[PDB]
C-alpha cells in the first residue's frame, strides 16, 4: 500500500548484506594509486650490484694503480754491470798487458 520503514529497512539490510558493492568500492578504487618510492628494498639491489661485478671491483683498483708500476736502478742490472766488467776481455787483459809489457827491464 506504501513505501515504508519495512521496505526501507529491507533495502538497508540488503545494502548491509551486499559485500560486492562496498568492498569493490573501497578496494578496487584504492588499488590504482598504489605506489611511489625509491624503495629501500631496491637500495639492497643497488648495493648488491655494487658488490656484484668485476668491472667495478677489479678495474677500480687495477686500472688506477697498475698504471704506475716502476722505478729502480735494478739490482738485476747490478748483475749485468758486474758481468760486463768481468767479461770486458779487451779492458782487463790489454790494460794489464800494455801496463806490464811496456817495461822491459
Amino acid at each position: 500500500x506504501x513505501x515504508x520503514x519495512x521496505x526501507x529497512x529491507x533495502x538497508x539490510x540488503x545494502x548491509x548484506x551486499x559485500x560486492x558493492x562496498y568492498x569493490x568500492x573501497x578496494x578496487x578504487x584504492x588499488x590504482x594509486x598504489x605506489x611511489x618510492x625509491x624503495x629501500x628494498x631496491x637500495x639492497x639491489x643497488x648495493x648488491x650490484x655494487x658488490x656484484x661485478x668485476x668491472x667495478x671491483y677489479x678495474x677500480x683498483x687495477x686500472x688506477x694503480x697498475x698504471x704506475x708500476x716502476x722505478x729502480x736502478x735494478x739490482x738485476x742490472x747490478x748483475x749485468x754491470x758486474x758481468x760486463x766488467x768481468x767479461x770486458x776481455x779487451x779492458x782487463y787483459x790489454x790494460x794489464x798487458x800494455x801496463x806490464x809489457x811496456x817495461x822491459x827491464x
Partner: protein, 371 residues
C-alpha cells in the same frame, strides 16, 4: 613510556603491551550490524557491534568479515574495530605509546599506505612499524635460521629466513587459510545434511573445527578404518539445540591442505610448496633449514600435522639428511609474543618511524623505511 602491539592477522585480534607474556584480551574482528526492525522501543539502538559483544548478540546481527585474504577490505569497519579495541579493552590513549603492526608479507602496498595514513592522522601516535610475520615467528621461536608456515584466518606463508637475512625470491604465498577451509566444510557437511548457511552459522563451524578435527596420518588407511570402525565418529551438540554426529567428515577437512582439490586450485599444497620453495633457495644453506622447521598459528592447532609433515618431507627429501619440525605449545599467540620481543629492544628507538617524517614526507616513507 611503553610500547604496544596490535595483531591484525585476521581471525581473533590480539593486542598487548611489550613484555607481558600474553596479550590482555582478544577479539574476533567480527563486525556485524542489525538485520531486523528494532521493535523494543525501550531498547537503545546501537547500529554497529564488534568483539565478544557481537559474539554474544550474533543471531540477529549479520557478519561482515573485514579482512579477506589478509588484505583488510573496508577501512571504516577496521576503524571501528581498532578504535573499540584501544578504548574499551586497553584503556589507552593514542598519544601514549608506539604501536606495532603485523602484516601478511608480499601483499598489496595499499594496506601499508592507508594503515599508516589513518593511524598517524585519525589517531596521532608516536611511532609506527609494520613487520613481516615470519620475522616475529622466528624471534619468539628463537632460532635465527628457519622456515615458517603460519596459516591464519588469512593468507598462508612460507618464508625461509636464514639467520639475519631474507630470501624474498624464496617466498610462497597462498590463499588456503582456515576460513576458506571452513567454508568448504559445509559443502562436505551437507552430505550428512544437518545444514545451515548464514554468516553466524558459518562461525558456528569454527567451534567444530576446534573440537572434532584431527589430521589424517595416511589418507587411504584412514578410509580403510572408516570402513572398519566408528571411533572415527563422535557425537557433538549444537552450541544450543541438537546433538550432531560426524564421520570421516571431520578428518577429511584438513586433508584439503595436503590435497587442495577439494576446494580446487592448483598449487600442489603445503608440503610440496615447502620443498619447492627450498629447492628454489640456494644449495649450501639447505641442511640448516631441513633441521630448523617451524610452524605456528591457525592451522597448526590441529593435532597431527607435524607427523604427516615429516612423512611428506621424508618422501621428498633424500632421506639421508636430518629432518625435524617444531610444534611449540603457544603457537596461536606466537606472533604477538614475538612482536613483544621485537618491541622490547632499544634498537627500535633507532628504528621506529616518527611523526616528524610523516610531516616531512608522505606515506611513501613507509615503503622505504620498513621491509
Amino acid at each position: 613510556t611503553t610500547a604496544l602491539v596490535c595483531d591484525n592477522g585476521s581471525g581473533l585480534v590480539k593486542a598487548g603491551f611489550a613484555g607481558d607474556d600474553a596479550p590482555r584480551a582478544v577479539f574476533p574482528s567480527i563486525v556485524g550490524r542489525p538485520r531486523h526492525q528494532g521493535v523494543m522501543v525501550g531498547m537503545g539502538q546501537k547500529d554497529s557491534y564488534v568483539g565478544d559483544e557481537a559474539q554474544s548478540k550474533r543471531g540477529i546481527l549479520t557478519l561482515k568479515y573485514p579482512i579477506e585474504h589478509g588484505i583488510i577490505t573496508n577501512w571504516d569497519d577496521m576503524e571501528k574495530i581498532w578504535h573499540h579495541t584501544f578504548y574499551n579493552e586497553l584503556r589507552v590513549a593514542p598519544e601514549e605509546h608506539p604501536t606495532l603492526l603485523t602484516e601478511a608479507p608480499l601483499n598489496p602496498k595499499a594496506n601499508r599506505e592507508k594503515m599508516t595514513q589513518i593511524m598517524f592522522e585519525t589517531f596521532n601516535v608516536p611511532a609506527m612499524y609494520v613487520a613481516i610475520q615470519a620475522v616475529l615467528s622466528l624471534y619468539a621461536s628463537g632460532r635465527t635460521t628457519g622456515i615458517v608456515l603460519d596459516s591464519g584466518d588469512g593468507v598462508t606463508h612460507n618464508v625461509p629466513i636464514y639467520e639475519g637475512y631474507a630470501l624474498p625470491h624464496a617466498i610462497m604465498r597462498l590463499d588456503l587459510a582456515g576460513r576458506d577451509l571452513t567454508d568448504y566444510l559445509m559443502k562436505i557437511l551437507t552430505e550428512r545434511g544437518y545444514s545451515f548457511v548464514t554468516t553466524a552459522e558459518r562461525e558456528i563451524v569454527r567451534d567444530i573445527k576446534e573440537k572434532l578435527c584431527y589430521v589424517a596420518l595416511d589418507f587411504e588407511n584412514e578410509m580403510a578404518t572408516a570402513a572398519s570402525s566408528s571411533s572415527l565418529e563422535k557425537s557433538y551438540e549444537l552450541p544450543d539445540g541438537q546433538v550432531i554426529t560426524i564421520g570421516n567428515e571431520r578428518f577429511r577437512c584438513p586433508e584439503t591442505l595436503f590435497q587442495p582439490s577439494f576446494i580446487g586450485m592448483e598449487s600442489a599444497g603445503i608440503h610440496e610448496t615447502t620443498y619447492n620453495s627450498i629447492m628454489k633457495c640456494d644449495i649450501d644453506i639447505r641442511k640448516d633449514l631441513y633441521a630448523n622447521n617451524v610452524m605456528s598459528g591457525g592451522t597448526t592447532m590441529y593435532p597431527g600435522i607435524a607427523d604427516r609433515m615429516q612423512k611428506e618431507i621424508t618422501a621428498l627429501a633424500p632421506s639421508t639428511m636430518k629432518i625435524k619440525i617444531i610444534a611449540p605449545p603457544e603457537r596461536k599467540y606466537s606472533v604477538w609474543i614475538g612482536g613483544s620481543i621485537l618491541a622490547s629492544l632499544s634498537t627500535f628507538q633507532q628504528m621506529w618511524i616518527t611523526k616528524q617524517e610523516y610531516d616531512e614526507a608522505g606515506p611513501s616513507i613507509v615503503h622505504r623505511k620498513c621491509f
